[PDB]
Design a protein around this ligand. Sequence first.
Ligand SMILES: Nc1ncnc2c1ncn2[C@@H]1O[C@H](COP(=O)(O)OP(=O)(O)OP(=O)(O)O)[C@@H](O)[C@H]1O
Ligand SMILES: Nc1ncnc2c1ncn2[C@@H]1O[C@H](COP(=O)(O)OP(=O)(O)OP(=O)(O)O)[C@@H](O)[C@H]1O
Ligand SMILES: [Cl-]
Ligand SMILES: [Cl-]
Ligand SMILES: [Mg+2]
Ligand SMILES: [Mg+2]
Ligand SMILES: [Mg+2]
Ligand SMILES: [Mg+2]
Ligand SMILES: [Mg+2]
Ligand code: NA
Ligand code: NA
Lengths: 386, 387
Amino acid sequence: TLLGTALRPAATRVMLLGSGELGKEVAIECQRLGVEVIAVDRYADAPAMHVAHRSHVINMLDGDALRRVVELEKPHYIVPEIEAIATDMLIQLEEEGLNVVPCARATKLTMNREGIRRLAAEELQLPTSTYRFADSESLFREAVADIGYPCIVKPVMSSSGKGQTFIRSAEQLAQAWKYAQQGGRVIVEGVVKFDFEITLLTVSAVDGVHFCAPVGHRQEDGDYRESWQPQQMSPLALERAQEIARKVVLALGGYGLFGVELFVCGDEVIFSEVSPRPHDTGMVTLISQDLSEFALHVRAFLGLPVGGIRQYGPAASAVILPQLTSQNVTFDNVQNAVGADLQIRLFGKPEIDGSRRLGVALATAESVVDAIERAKHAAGQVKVQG
Amino acid sequence: TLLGTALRPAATRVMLLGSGELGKEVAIECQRLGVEVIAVDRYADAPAMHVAHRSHVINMLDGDALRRVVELEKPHYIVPEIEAIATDMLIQLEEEGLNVVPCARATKLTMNREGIRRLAAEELQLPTSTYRFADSESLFREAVADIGYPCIVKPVMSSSGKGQTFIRSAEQLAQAWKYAQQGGGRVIVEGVVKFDFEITLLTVSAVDGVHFCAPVGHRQEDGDYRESWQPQQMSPLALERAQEIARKVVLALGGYGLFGVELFVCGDEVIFSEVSPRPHDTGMVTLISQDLSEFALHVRAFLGLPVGGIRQYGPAASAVILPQLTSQNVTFDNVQNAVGADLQIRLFGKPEIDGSRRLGVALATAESVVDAIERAKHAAGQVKVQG
Ligand SMILES: Nc1ncnc2c1ncn2[C@@H]1O[C@H](COP(=O)(O)OP(=O)(O)OP(=O)(O)O)[C@@H](O)[C@H]1O
Ligand SMILES: Nc1ncnc2c1ncn2[C@@H]1O[C@H](COP(=O)(O)OP(=O)(O)OP(=O)(O)O)[C@@H](O)[C@H]1O
Ligand SMILES: [Cl-]
Ligand SMILES: [Cl-]
Ligand SMILES: [Mg+2]
Ligand SMILES: [Mg+2]
Ligand SMILES: [Mg+2]
Ligand SMILES: [Mg+2]
Ligand SMILES: [Mg+2]
Ligand code: NA
Ligand code: NA
């Protein structure tokens, strides 16, 4: 592995397609190795742009737009941060010689639920919830009847729990459909009754597949609120979780860190979905590991061996997710949100108009329970105004 | 403490005066809090500028130039990375209401050996090498005569060893005096301390008081640190004494921030040497060794936030990547052999080199400090620096 010096002729150039808080840390990790960073998003002054050598604003779902920026910047790597991007162009570009992280196919399969679910369940024969896809209200109703109650309906292209409804009875059929349309095609999944859920951060690298200690999390409105590590699990469940994760990542292909979402039922594990990149719940790794999930993703995609990952003990993250409308957000009472074994991150997002993740609180303790309280408490201390 | 959002009207603005690798990490820590960063240096594309919102290239020794940039950017904090700045202008600006980290007086006292040394030895009554100031070869010649051999001669406005000479013999004096003019017309003649080892006691002064990082040991060569490690093994008595010295010094200098207190240890005795009113290069080991790096600590402190505690993650070490060549397009090969479990490397982004220059650093942890040092050294040594 050979790296150039940023801004010099032999520079190693990385293009980030999505400049949110996750891309921001990847940018900082690239910058720490003198890697040249070009940050792309759909709005100006996006978090990763604050720490990039150059920034561009385009429609990331527009293949033509994608090709233009790639031709202009000639990056060695293209690192997407989200699912909603021009995956067919990524495939083309990859064929033309661009290194798409982890690979264009991994991005194509995961941008919509159909690609990934069918691969996991049908091709890899991994355990998953029951599911049925639907492209009409009528077919939607037929799917629910077959799957049974309760079930969850979700748009095939969505994130953060958007357009999803937990369906308990036929009464909600009409509204569930509407709501889902607001997020065409949908997935209807049977409800898995897990003991708990985890994110297994799995790194595929030149030296093999590595696993971070399991990360547990709390969802609210199908969006992450708190995360912690390590999540206690049986030896058998851990092993089965690792086998599943290893299969998924290798099937998807290429080097990078993946966030494998799993449901745990005693010693049994069920596959949910996977981010072919750093995962939001993995932000806990900003305090809990020697190498954060961001540092690990960078290490792997550059072709360097991971070697190993150190976990420092019980830790947790808690989101800073206010609700307001402002283009000039401020954060007060910060003196009461940081301290011994307690930190915060403020993303630099330029504005908000409703609910948006503006930061994260991080803590360590002698138990995950204590870490979770410490982190939640700190996040709540922050006085968001605008 | 109220923080705005960078690039927004209520943004909190930090101006870095010096954009090297140390400034680069402070910038990162500011950016992690959505603090707006303006990186200033005397050359373009300095490391901290890569990660800043914007930058300016000026002669930091030119007070007017300094005022102009300051006035243009209206920063809420002015954070120096080096001694070579128009400190007089810092004083004024502070007088006009600017927040200089840790305080302007602190910078002034330490940019001139005569200030800090007199403060420490005289005012503070602390243990230091013997020394003498002089304004003429006569006085110099005279002084070296008072100190004896061997002895060190340093400009009063010198760093990285620039303009220094270790004198064991009279023949040198030709040179000595002339060298003290090469770099930096006044000097200091210090006695030689025969310590068991040197340490850097990273001391943070914040709203919740003064806290210490575990002592950092190091190896210097040709005025450049080569390897540093933590924690350096010393007696509790010695550590206790070191902290005392550090506290006394930081509080006397005043202001919030992270200070690098340089000390010598002989048995249970500790001798004050000097202090950086900012993060110290040897403290780069803290990038792997603690929950809060010296850079994170500096920012936490200057922003008026509480530190609470500092966690140390066992034996750790840093080893510099310090090649010597001339190039404006450096590349680094064999990196795959410089990273792995408990091992990381940093490459600074310096635009060019023309002689000896620090281009990166290797960081390692292990079961023993010795093992940590070797792991780090070996890693730094595997990087192939091409021109
Ligand atoms: N079949 C299922 N059974 C039980 N709970 C489920 C099921 N599907 C999803 N959930 C719950 O809803 C949460 C969100 O689901 P999911 O991750 O599929 O949505 P998303 O929109 O893709 O969110 P993101 O991509 O941000 O993780 C899960 O983390 C889990 O708590
Ligand atoms: N009196 C002394 N006795 C023994 N060694 C000394 C003495 N003064 C300096 N040294 C050695 O030289 C190194 C550099 O000395 P000093 O720190 O005073 O120089 P400097 O130019 O101010 O460098 P910097 O500001 O970058 O540390 C010390 O770290 C120490 O190893
Ligand atoms: Cl996404
Ligand atoms: Cl189906
Ligand atoms: Mg998802
Ligand atoms: Mg999410
Ligand atoms: Mg999910
Ligand atoms: Mg000095
Ligand atoms: Mg020194
Ligand atoms: Na920039
Ligand atoms: Na790839």
